[PDB]
A paper describes a structure:
Integrins are heterodimeric proteins composed of a single alpha (α) and beta (β) subunit. Integrins canonically exist in a conformational spectrum from a closed, compact state to an open, extended state, with the closed state considered inactive and the open state considered the major signaling state. The β7 integrin family, encompassing α4β7 [Lymphocyte Peyer’s patch adhesion molecule-1 (LPAM-1)] and αEβ7 (CD103), performs critical roles in facilitating immune cell homing, activation, and retention at sensitive immune barriers. Here, we compare cryo–electron microscopy structures of apo and ligand-bound states of the I domain–containing αEβ7 integrin and the I domain–lacking α4β7 integrin to illuminate how the I domain intrinsically mimics an extrinsic ligand to preserve integrin function.
At a global resolution of 3.4 Å, the ligand-binding interface was well resolved; we modeled the integrin headpiece region and E-cadherin EC1. We find E-cadherin EC1 exclusively binds to the distal surface of the αE I domain, using a short E-cadherin construct (EC12). Despite this, we observed that E-cadherin is only present in a monomeric state when bound to αEβ7. The αEβ7:E-cadherin complex is highly stable, with a dissociation constant (Kd) of 51 ± 7.9 nM measured using biolayer interferometry (BLI). We found that the αE I domain forms a salt bridge with residue 1 of the mature E-cadherin molecule, effectively outcompeting adherens junctions by preventing the “strand-swap” step necessary for E-cadherin’s trans-dimerization due to E-cadherin’s higher affinity to αEβ7 than to itself. The αE I domain αMIDAS is ion occupied in our structure, and the ion coordination complex is completed by E-cadherin E31. The ligand-bound αEβ7 integrin assumes an open headpiece conformation. In contrast to the unliganded structure, the I domain internal ligand is consistently engaged with β7 when bound to E-cadherin. (H) The β7 βMIDAS coordination sphere is completed in the ligand-bound αEβ7 via the internal ligand E372. However, 3D flexibility analysis of the dataset shows that the β7 leg still maintains a notable, yet restricted, degree of free movement (27° β7 hybrid movement compared to 68° in the apo-open structure).
Author numbering:
A (entry chain A): 1 to 139, 181 to 809
B (entry chain B): 80 to 458
C (entry chain C): 1 to 103
């Protein structure tokens, strides 16, 4: 129909950007149109948003400046548009100290109508941002190195006590510290590693080799033991991590004897920077001050709580007090409840006004969902969720994913927000914000019919006549199953009197494809038919998967709006194979309704997976057709000339229609005396009247004079006194040549034929 | 001259499991003396005394919520294998596993928990994975018991578990799972709802799943993080295309979720993995007992001038109305059921006096032998 | 650490010399070779070498006869070093009394 699949503009194949979604944006105050595209992060892509405009019949792209910068893996980029501005959200990862699980919330930047930056938002510590009275308007780890003195001068009982201390500390640290890893060394005489950091990955094996270690007597080399621990255990060559905090536990009798390295040569060395030290006195030979001084020099600077005796198993708290961890309750374990840690605010979004935005929160409260109504100016918002106070069992509402999609409804009285919950009771539901007293909560209004269909994953209100109300609401069930996943899209008429929903139609793709995923992407494309109603577009990304050579697959359907609602059958079906090769998943994102091509008509955009296509639209010419005869009424027994005049003209005009009207062709035939066994009127040039093919020059008019006359041979004798009827049938043929302009098209909903009458003069008192 | 028909050997039917103890067809030898325009007839009977072969993939969830239920699955495997091996001589049983995708919202990504997902470091555990094929379909029962008795639990972040990916990959990975193309059964164990297509969006996975095999050499579905979970439609289509009947042995709490899935996947069955676990074994025996066959009578090439035809009769007086070659087949035979046939032979002219031919059931080891004597001359 | 009983050497004994009074025993000797060097007034400062110690055993020996009534007591110390040159035991202030003969 309108869409000009002849000349599609494509972003360069393979190279950047990698388009995940495309949307056109027009600045109201400047009438500039850009084709915005979001892309994931790579070593080549400069950012998550680009603006691309058509120059030299090529789509050229640049990065938007003040958008937030993604980092690390791809985790979601949302871009939504309204005549007030653009809102771009990026899912980001943050880890807090001593937390064993990470948070995942959004970072959003609101640019104005001209893509300059206006507002910023970081949804960490959401409990601060919340104001539950806000009116809703509607109009590294640690590593411990144990250096154990088996030098002799330590009777076996003391060795066993030290061994027990090691085992007890190890067990407690494994029980109550998760990111703790251990090492062990024994330096009586030679230095002898008993197990390494790499062994500590197995708690049972490391704990088991403790109680099996044997003594080595000889001589007390503390300095060499510590230097070896620094040089061969706290090093990456033996599994030591760069950022992990490092700790030591010297378990010695403080009797240093025959050691080459001054113990100050080691404690003041470069490598001991940043390494904690705990001393412990094994046995009892602290009769003199030398042992105490050595033991404390081993101990870190704050000698309090850094020197002990093996008998005090409570010695190494502080480490166990500071290294305590917390877990988000996960899949069978006890822990902190999920409130806002993984809310994913910004998953969906809708700009309501210059100040306020509405953000989906699919993950809040065990993935029940919600939506944060965020006032960017004051930086405060309200959380809107399903009410759990009616019945104490909120478990029935977990994993609903309310907020997977969000929309608004512009009823004649007030706005009314709706939110899709594509896993409600495993069917899916569409919620509507209802307000009563001092409370405002979501309640279930529509429900799906099949498990796993994802009913409510996409919503598209449509104002069919552009009057401020919302007449229909389209709800998507992209994974509906009959044979495969064909998809399905419901069409809910919206009542003006009551504001409730009533079903009108169920839409399904062209038969023969089992995996279309019809309903994945819906976008009200504004006015493409140039007739002041709202047309819709529905995508089917997987239509054609694996067919033939697999060059391209996908489809997009166009549903022209009508006075009584959305049309019954699509007016067009763009197929991937007819646009260009290499298009895969053509139809996953769609937008349009603005002039990006350079002429007054609206244009569409359909993003594939990895490319964006832009389609111009064609003028619609509806032809006025009129005629006259000579003589006006057939005389009695007329054998004379029947001269005709057949004048054509245009009935609706635009600049584009003027630009393109004049390189297509008109083709019209004349059928004379319709419906009779035999005709009364010839065509003096049979080749001509039965078929003509003319070219159209200027202005709006193109007329022709053609000749008829009485049928050859004997004249009719059975129907002389009745009227004749002449039917003109016109078709418009468009060459494929390289005409710069989009060539016109006749209206699909208007008859291509027009019928006139040629009377006859009866013999009665009144001829006609 | 006149024709004659005769039987040359005797053999009764039997009910053994193995070929020597089993009987498939009528006695082995007969004789027929044909003459021009004088057809003669023979009678045949068939019995399926042996059982069909079977293939059985046991696919169990190894998330942490299953720690209390692992005794049940470990016993279910044994109680299933004993029953099946008491009936069919040639069972094959495999084993696979699954936890979830390795992306943040589903599985924690911090390295410490990625190595040791369990709450405490004293627990015996294993790193998360999406699908880990552990034992290709084999006749070694002891291997299956030893392997199923060795796996350890993993962790996860969300109650939904991604077993749909495992089912799809089991369906699509035929060459390395080890399917024999005979009869297939999948026994899927879990105690949680399942992820479906659309859930991957939360983890940033945009690429729709595709119907191709993605098992590494070690058996892991490594590329899982890059594709979305399959839709129930895709799973149904794949299982149907591969003729696999699923049997969801699911906990009494996750049973209501899977009893609606049973309606979409047509041939499936759902049971409760109780402490007794006889109901699931009975379901699997009912699935095995659904197997039926259509028996056809093959025959050897006839000598010049000779012809042949068939007739069949099912249980009861029922015949087959399709004449000629159609009556050479009988359908809907199950365990220890029997059917019968009549084969007619005719001669137009003689060329060799002696001859021989052979017939049998379609693809069966036992066969029949016919000795022909076609004559033109007078007595 | 050290193991030393109270110390005394009577007045003006009969020879010959040296004579053993007490033993200056260290503690880390179980790991080996704790050598000695007595010092202080009386050993390495006048009166010269009145008391000297054997370097390995630790025997404190009197070198020549004594009298209190010239000096009442002789304070002393002991360095104690290992074979690697590092000190082991810090000095302990021995204090010997020539116990009077009531004359
Ligand atoms: C950007 O494009 C829009 C849409 O075409 C333009 O809006 C149009 O603005 C004109 C005035 O500039 C509006 O009035 C027109 O004026 C005269 C009578 O005064 C007459 O030629 C027309 O009948 C018309 O009334 C016009 O209604 C308005 N169109 C719409 C649909 O609202 C806008 O001006 C453009 N902006 C710039 C900066 O050029
Ligand atoms: C809808 O959202 C409301 C909040 O706007 C949810 O109610 C809240 O539910 C949480 C569940 O954890 C309650 O948290 C409480 O916090 C502490 C710390 O654990 C403790 O007192 C309790 O054990 C409990 O966990 C919270 O009090 C409660 N109310 C408020 C005002 O926050 C509600 O659950 C959501 N409904 C659904 C269906 O998701
Ligand atoms: C003008 O349009 C008419 C249809 O409105 C064309 O008529 C067709 O002519 C072909 C032969 O050329 C016939 O086989 C078809 O049955 C006719 N009708 C249709 C609907 O195709 C006519 O050909 C056109 N003229 C030119 C010059 O192309
Ligand atoms: C550990 O026990 C083994 C025997 O099981 C023994 O050979 C070894 O010496 C013991 N000691 C250590 C430190 O492993
Ligand atoms: C099963 O049959 C298919 C289709 O004929 C064949 O390609 C395949 O090799 C066979 N075996 C297996 C294990 O799939
Ligand atoms: C060690 O260094 C100190 C000064 O830090 C020095 O006095 C001492 O002699 C050195 N040697 C020993 C054995 O302590
Ligand atoms: Ca309206
Ligand atoms: Ca329209
Ligand atoms: Ca245009
Ligand atoms: Mn020692
Ligand atoms: Mn459980
Ligand atoms: Mn689980
Ligand atoms: Mn999970």
């Amino acid at each position: 129909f309108n869409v000009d699949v002849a000349r599609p503009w494509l972003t360069p194949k393979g190279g950047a950007p990698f388009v995940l979604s495309s949307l056109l944006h027009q600045d109201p105050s400047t009438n500039q149109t850009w084709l915005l595209v979001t892309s994931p992060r790579t070593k080549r892509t400069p950012g998550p948003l680009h603006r691309c405009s058509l120059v030299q019949d090529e789509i050229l792209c640049h990065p938007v400046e003040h958008v937030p910068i993604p980092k690390g893996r791809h985790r979601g980029v949302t871009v939504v548009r309204s005549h007030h501005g653009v809102l771009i959200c990026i899912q980001v990862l943050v880890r807090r100290p001593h937390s064993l699980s990470s948070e995942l919330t959004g970072t959003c930047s609101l640019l104005g109508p001209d893509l300059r930056p206006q507002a910023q938002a970081n949804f960490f510590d959401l409990e601060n941002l919340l104001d539950p009275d806000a009116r809703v308007d509607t109009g590294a780890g640690t590593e411990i190195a144990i250096i154990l003195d088996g030098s002799g001068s330590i009777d076996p009982p003391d060795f066993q006590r030290a061994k027990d201390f090691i085992s007890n500390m190890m067990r407690n640290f494994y029980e109550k510290c998760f990111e703790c890893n251990f090492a062990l060394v024994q330096y009586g005489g030679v230095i002898q590693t008993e197990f390494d950091l790499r062994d500590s990955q197995d708690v049972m094996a490391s704990l088991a080799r403790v109680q099996n270690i044997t003594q080595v007597g000889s001589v007390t080399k503390t300095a060499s033991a510590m230097q070896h621990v620094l040089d061969s255990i706290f090093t990456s060559s033996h599994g030591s991590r760069r950022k992990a905090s490092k700790v030591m536990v010297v378990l010695t009798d403080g009797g240093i004897f025959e050691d080459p390295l001054n113990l100050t040569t080691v404690i003041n060395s470069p490598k001991m920077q940043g390494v904690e030290r705990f001393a412990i006195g094994v046995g009892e030979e602290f009769k003199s001050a030398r042992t105490a001084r050595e033991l404390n020099l081993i101990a870190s600077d704050p000698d309090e709580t850094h020197a002990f005796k093996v008998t005090n198993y409570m010695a190494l708290d502080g480490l166990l007090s500071k290294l305590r961890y917390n877990i988000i309750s996960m899949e069978g374990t006890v822990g902190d409840a999920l409130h806002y840690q993984l809310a994913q605010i910004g998953f969906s979004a809708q700009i309501l006004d210059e100040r306020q935005v509405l953000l989906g929160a699919v993950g809040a409260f065990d993935w029940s969902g919600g939506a944060l109504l965020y006032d960017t100016r004051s930086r405060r918002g309200r959380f809107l969720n399903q009410t759990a106070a009616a019945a104490a069992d909120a478990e029935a509402a977990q994993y609903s994913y309310l907020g997977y999609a969000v929309a608004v409804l512009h009823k004649t009285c007030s706005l009314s927000y709706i939110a899709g919950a594509p896993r409600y009771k495993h069917h899916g539901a569409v919620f509507e914000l209802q307000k009563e007293g001092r409370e405002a909560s979501f309640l279930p209004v529509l429900e799906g019919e099949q498990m796993g269909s994802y009913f409510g994953s996409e919503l598209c209100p449509v104002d069919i006549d552009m009057d401020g109300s919302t007449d229909f609401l389209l709800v998507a069930a992209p994974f509906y199953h009959v044979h495969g996943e064909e998809g399905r899209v419901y069409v809910y008429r919206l009542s003006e009197q009551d504001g409730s929903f009533s079903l009108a139609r169920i839409l399904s793709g062209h038969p023969g494809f089992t995996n279309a995923r019809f309903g994945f992407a819906m976008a009200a494309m504004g006015d493409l038919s140039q007739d002041k109603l709202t047309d819709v577009a529905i995508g089917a990304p997987l239509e054609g998967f694996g067919a033939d050579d697999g060059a391209s697959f996908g489809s997009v359907y166009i549903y022209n709006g009508h006075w009584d609602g959305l049309s019954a059958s699509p007016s067009q079906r763009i197929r991937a194979s007819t646009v260009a090769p290499g298009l895969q998943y053509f139809g996953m994102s769609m937008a349009g309704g603005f002039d990006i091509s350079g002429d007054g008509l609206a244009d569409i955009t359909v993003g594939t997976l990895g490319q964006a296509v832009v389609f111009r639209s064609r003028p619609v010419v509806r032809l006025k057709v009129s005629m006259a005869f000579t003589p006006s009424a057939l005389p009695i027994g007329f054998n004379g000339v029947v001269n005709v005049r057949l004048c054509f003209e245009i009935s609706s005009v635009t600049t584009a229609s003027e630009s393109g009207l004049r390189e297509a062709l008109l083709n019209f035939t004349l059928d004379v005396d319709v419906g009779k066994q035999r005709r009364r009127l010839q065509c003096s040039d049979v080749r001509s009247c039965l078929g003509c093919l003319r070219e159209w020059s200027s202005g709006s008019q193109l007329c022709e004079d053609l000749l008829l006359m009485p049928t050859e041979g004997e004249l009719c004798e059975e129907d002389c006194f009745s009227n004749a009827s002449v039917k003109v049938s016109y078709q418009l043929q468009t060459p494929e040549g390289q005409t710069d302009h989009p060539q016109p098209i006749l209206d699909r909903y208007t008859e291509p034929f027009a019928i006139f009458q040629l009377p006859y003069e009866k013999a009665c008192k009144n001829k006609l | 001259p006149r024709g004659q028909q005769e039987v040359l050997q005797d053999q009764p039917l039997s009910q053994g499991a193995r070929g020597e103890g089993a009987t498939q067809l009528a006695p082995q030898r007969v004789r027929v003396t044909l003459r021009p325009g004088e057809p003669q007839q023979l009678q045949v009977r068939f019995l399926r005394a042996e059982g069909y072969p079977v293939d059985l993939y046991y696919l169990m969830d190894l998330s942490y919520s299953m720690k209390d239920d692992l005794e049940r699955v470990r016993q279910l495997g044994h109680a299933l294998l004993v029953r099946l091996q008491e009936v069919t001589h040639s069972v094959r049983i495999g084993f696979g596993s699954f936890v979830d995708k390795t992306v943040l919202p589903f599985v924690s990504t911090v390295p410490s928990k990625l190595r040791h997902p369990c709450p405490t470091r004293l627990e015996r555990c294993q790193s998360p994975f999406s699908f880990h094929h552990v034992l290709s379909l084999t006749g070694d029962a002891q291997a299956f018991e030893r392997e199923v008795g060795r796996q350890s639990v993993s962790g996860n972040l969300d109650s939904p578990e991604g077993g749909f990916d495992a089912i799809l990959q089991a369906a699509l990975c035929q060459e390395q799972i080890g399917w024999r193309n005979v009869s297939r059964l999948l026994v899927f164990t879990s105690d949680d709802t399942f992820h479906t297509a659309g859930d991957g969006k939360l983890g940033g996975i945009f690429m729709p799943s595709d119907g191709h095999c993605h098992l590494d050499s070690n058996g892991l579905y490594s590329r899982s993080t890059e594709f979305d979970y399959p839709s129930v439609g895709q799973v149904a289509q794949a299982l149907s295309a591969a003729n696999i009947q699923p049997i969801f042995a699911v906990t009494s709490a996750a049973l209501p979720v899977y009893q609606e899935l049973s309606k979409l996947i047509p041939k499936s069955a759902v049971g409760e993995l109780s402490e007794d676990s006889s109901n699931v074994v009975q379901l699997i025996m009912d699935a095995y007992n659904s197997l039926s066959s259509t028996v056809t009578l093959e025959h050897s090439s006839l000598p010049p001038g000779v012809h042949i035809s068939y007739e069949s009769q099912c249980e009861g007086p029922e015949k087959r109305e399709g004449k000629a070659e159609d009556r050479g087949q009988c359908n809907h035979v199950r365990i220890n059921q029997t059917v019968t046939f009549w084969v007619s032979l005719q001669a137009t002219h003689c060329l060799p006096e002696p001859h021989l031919l052979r017939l049998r059931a379609l693809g069966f080891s036992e066969e029949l032998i016919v000795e022909l004597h076609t004559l033109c001359d007078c007595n | 650490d050290w193991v030393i009983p109270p110390i005394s050497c009577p007045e003006n004994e009969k020879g010959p010399f040296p004579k053993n009074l007490v033993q200056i025993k260290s503690n880390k000797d179980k790991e080996g070779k704790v050598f000695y060097s007595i010092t202080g007034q009386g050993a390495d400062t006048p009166p010269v070498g009145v008391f000297i110690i054997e370097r390995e055993t630790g025997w404190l020996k009197v070198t020549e006869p004594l009298d209190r009534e010239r000096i009442a007591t002789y304070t002393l110390f002991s360095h104690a070093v290992s074979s690697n040159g590092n000190a082991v035991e810090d000095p302990m202030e021995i204090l010997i009394t020539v116990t009077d003969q009531n004359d």
